[PDB]
Design a protein around this nucleic acid. Structure first.
Ligand SMILES: C[C@@H]1CCO[C@H]2Cn3cc(C(=O)NCc4ccc(F)cc4F)c(=O)c(O)c3C(=O)N12
Ligand SMILES: C[C@@H]1CCO[C@H]2Cn3cc(C(=O)NCc4ccc(F)cc4F)c(=O)c(O)c3C(=O)N12
Ligand SMILES: [Mg+2]
Ligand SMILES: [Mg+2]
Ligand SMILES: [Mg+2]
Ligand SMILES: [Mg+2]
Ligand SMILES: [Zn+2]
Ligand SMILES: [Zn+2]
Lengths: 237, 47, 66, 261, 261, 237, 66, 47
DNA sequence: CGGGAAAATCTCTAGCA
DNA sequence: ACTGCTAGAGATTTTCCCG
DNA sequence: CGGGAAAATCTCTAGCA
DNA sequence: ACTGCTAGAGATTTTCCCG
């Protein structure tokens, strides 16, 4: 409540996003969003071949997290089934395919329509190369190919660590989805309050931002003012 | 008027909507397609 | 430095149970987390809880409402 | 009481009367009637009236099989979150179950699986899988489905959903995936008002973040506490209370009679 | 909300999401999400979380059959007292059951029997017996054993005793009578610390005595009460409260605004 | 507590039992028992014959309440079984038999020993005559004889009312057993307290009688004195 | 005469239940008894109870311990 | 020392007395004639 | 008025199949 | 228009007994 | 500080077979 | 040495909103 001006100065000086502001100055995130205003569901789907069997790989673009299963036939049914599975395990909003015959079937289209996925026809190929490398590294430890494929998916998602932080793809996908959940929660709050108008001290209508226990933060004429709760009236428009 | 949904008799499939004809403590009397039944309230939902 | 870290660690909520009460006690504040035990604080009462009994979340919907 | 006791043992030996009846009829102290009943082997016919509580650590999964329309459905649940992975399988065999489990362990952090003693879960090939993935295997007490109450209730729930959406698929495997989707993302409640997918994300992310934060705090905040004893390692000071760990034993002591060095 | 509602009905039609999920994702008032779920026929899959309570009038008996070692045991319980009469029978037939019931009605005051819908209890010959003895027949809701929870728990208890004393008889009918004896006279507890035999004596004697006493009081204490109405018949005055019976309707009114004539 | 002297006078004047005293003067029954001090479990067992079948009748002597069942053979097994049944339905302390062959069997003796009944080898015959009368009255309403026997047992125990009060045998047996339960309860209380000695005001040991909420009734030198609780000490001897 | 009768009628104990509570409420005093209803008094509170819900005894172990 | 009486595994017949070897919250480990078992505390009685 | 121990009450489970 | 219950085991709270 | 309504919490059940 | 649980329905209590 007091750090609002400090936050405004910091943002004018460094162009900092709402997270770093609501973290360093202890502000409710709707207020930091107002100041700063004053991918996660994207997967790539491609089929690869290896020892005469079809491996249907899905990569989470933001993290490099891999879901691959050996399928029986490069048909539309096996791909629609793989896609329902993926959409039930992770939040999937958009798949990037390559206009192959199976990816364009009416079956996959009905699957995407049921699971609310959007279809859009380079990381996938490098990931196929890494997957094939690990599969060749662990082929002598399984009889069948599907087993070695899952061993490789495991090694890639959890036993290979890279990037800046030194994390693995599972850690990365969990961090990314967590941040994404936060984004939807914040947007839901903003959408919940953005239909209220506040009259304070009476002055003109103000965009409401927060409704704490001891104050009511608002925004009037592109400027943020804190008022005590009893000094203002909140109505829904 | 009320809509009743009920599990009748060993059949694990819920049916309805039926008309509620009578409600007591513990059980209800309903009419599902001219067929009057008596169902324990553990096995009904009245709306 | 350190006090930032501690204030962060105390923002995670904990749901937990006592060894003979089936209901999950509402959100407490996390003070310390070890391998076996979690130290919480529920209504100004500092309980120790075994890890197998504690669900440590963060509630994102609450965090983003203040 | 020596007379009244012997007339009571002779009558219990015939009728096995409860302690109230032998207190009312032979004028006995209730403790003595209870000692009589408590020494009859034939009267010990009842167990405690409690329940245990299942482990709910962040890395424990409960697996079970369930049957529907003649097919076998293997199901896993993440205990802490309620997040499920199901899959229709060809047959309740150890090979298929070991496959399902390798997939799960590659898609999520699985530290411990808990199952009943079905032959597929106890097979030597599910054990080789768990050994490769570094999973700990926990087997229930035999014929105690309450040891797996979470997965067993999830069967209820999965079956309940599959019946709501069965008319939208043709095959059962499709409807099983539809139900896994609906449960993991389209049903909200429990701790935090979440869905199970959001909740597993929160649980796992919280585990990583708290591990990191506490690692840093302990690297920095390095002190020894003497209370009432040895140099107990400090855990948390605040609000006039001190929590320490003396010889791998965690206890809460008030700030009085506790010096920090 | 008109936009958010239609996006919610379209999504429920596919996933059958619960009201919390449609409130969180389409920004809806919980009452509106609940109205959406409440109009989906496919989502009405659960009943109330209560229980009824069985009738416990002094003259109601619950009868059931139970099976042990290949024989049929017919059992009756007096609901108010817990007092049992059991008997091994040749076969679960209406003839045998009508016989058992004539015996019971001649040994005790039986006004009403309550049974499930087993074929022996619903036979036309058990009905002729009940009509001769002036018994009212109450049949449960089919496949609802909870309607007979008293007799069903008595099966538990009878079977439990028969197992304690089975090695003292040779035949099963002997052990059944031994168990009826032990239950009715050698087990104490419940209301009044009684045994079931003492308790049935107390219940029946109390019923007779209270009937007589109240008959006399009403013959003597004859008054009409006007409160707030008609000449309501007085029931009980005392302690500043008046209980009356206006048109077969019993209500408690304070002494104020109530004159006795 | 105050009516003790009135009770003593009434008993010296009319020799009234402890019930009428503890009812008219509102006294705890142990006290009325002390003042007045200063069958129920008896059954008759006989077999009768009728249409070539054996009917085994039991009569409660005090009330005239009848238990009769047609039995298959006048053997010791059927009589031991009838006796176990009776002893499990009613409190049976002593049976009066007639030294017949079945009543003297080792089987009936073992039954009586298990059920704690005492065996002792005119009302039974008059009751057999009344039973036969009712059976002849209701024979046309049943096919078998056992059914008519139970119809007659019913008519006798509940539909025939006689004696002083105008009661039936079922009402009578319930009243008698109720009074008997009261007798055992009182005797149990007397046996529970008769091992205590009270010292009041200190005076010599006194036989304790009651331990109410506001007093302690005792009996010393064949005389009953009420003392307040704090003025006396209760010990167990 | 009549007051003796009434004091007698009020010596019978009543156990009873309310329509959604499974536990039997402890002994109340009986004030009136009809065909359908029993009027009791539990802790200076005059409830009406349906007959099917009331267990009316006298408790003989109590009549005799005072 | 304790005596344990237990219902083991689908057998509805209670056995014992066994020695208690270990008691946890939820279950106990007993020794019945050199045969170590693990029984849920819902299915045991310790004396 | 204070504790200690024992009585009384309360809470909760399996089995009824 | 009908309806879960009962008894034992352990935990927890009340009552009573002597100070 | 007072009610009213809505949110939040609590209590309790079936089914898991 | 391991362990009933989950989600919905209705009832009941809290909280919040404007006075
Ligand atoms: C041959 C494997 C190994 C050995 O035992 C059998 C038999 N069994 C029986 C049930 C069962 O009785 N469910 C009803 C239930 C009752 C109470 C409760 F708390 C939870 C509940 F689920 C199962 O669920 C189950 O998976 C098995 C099984 O797998 N097996
Ligand atoms: C053919 C007759 C007529 C129609 O129905 C069947 C089947 N049935 C089933 C049970 C039973 O499931 N008992 C377990 C139980 C479960 C819950 C509960 F609250 C009480 C309980 F006793 C009985 O007891 C019983 O007598 C019968 C029976 O007689 N019949
Ligand atoms: Mg299983
Ligand atoms: Mg199972
Ligand atoms: Mg039956
Ligand atoms: Mg039954
Ligand atoms: Zn015994
Ligand atoms: Zn629906």
């Amino acid at each position: 409540l007091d750090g609002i001006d400090k936050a405004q100065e910091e943002h004018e000086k460094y162009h900092s996003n709402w997270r770093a502001m609501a973290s360093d100055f202890n502000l409710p995130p709707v207020v930091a969003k107002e100041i700063v205003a004053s991918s996660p569901g994207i997967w790539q789907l491609d089929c690869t071949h290896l020892e005469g069997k079809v491996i249907l790989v899905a990569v989470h673009v933001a993290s490099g997290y891999i879901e691959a299963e050996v399928i029986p036939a490069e048909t539309g049914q096996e791909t629609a089934y793989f896609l329902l599975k993926l959409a039930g395990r992770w939040p999937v909003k958009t798949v990037h395919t390559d206009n192959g015959s199976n990816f364009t079937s009416t079956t996959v289209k009905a699957a995407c329509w049921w699971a609310g996925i959007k279809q859009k026809f380079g990381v996938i190929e490098s990931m196929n190369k890494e997957l094939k490398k690990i599969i060749g590294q662990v082929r002598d430890q399984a009889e069948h190919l599907k087993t070695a494929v899952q061993m490789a998916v495991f090694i890639h998602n959890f036993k290979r660590k890279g990037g800046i932080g030194g994390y693995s793809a599972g850690e990365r996908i969990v961090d990314i989805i967590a941040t994404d959940i936060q984004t939807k929660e914040l947007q839901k709050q903003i959408t919940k309050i953005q239909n209220f108008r506040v009259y304070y001290r009476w002055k003109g209508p103000a965009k409401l931002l927060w409704k704490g226990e001891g104050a009511v933060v608002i925004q009037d004429n592109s400027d943020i003012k804190v008022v005590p709760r009893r000094k203002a009236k909140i109505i829904r428009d | 008027n009320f809509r009743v949904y009920y599990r009748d008799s060993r059949d694990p499939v819920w049916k309805g909507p039926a008309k509620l004809l009578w409600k007591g403590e513990g059980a209800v009397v309903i009419q599902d397609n001219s067929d009057i039944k008596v169902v324990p309230r553990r096995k009904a939902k009245i709306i | 430095e350190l006090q930032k870290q501690i204030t962060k660690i105390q923002n995670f909520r904990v749901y937990y149970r006592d060894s003979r009460d089936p209901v999950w006690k509402g959100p407490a504040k996390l003070l310390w987390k070890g391998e076996g035990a979690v130290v919480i604080q529920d209504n100004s009462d500092i309980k120790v809880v075994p890890r197998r009994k504690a669900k440590i979340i963060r509630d994102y919907g609450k965090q983003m409402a203040g």
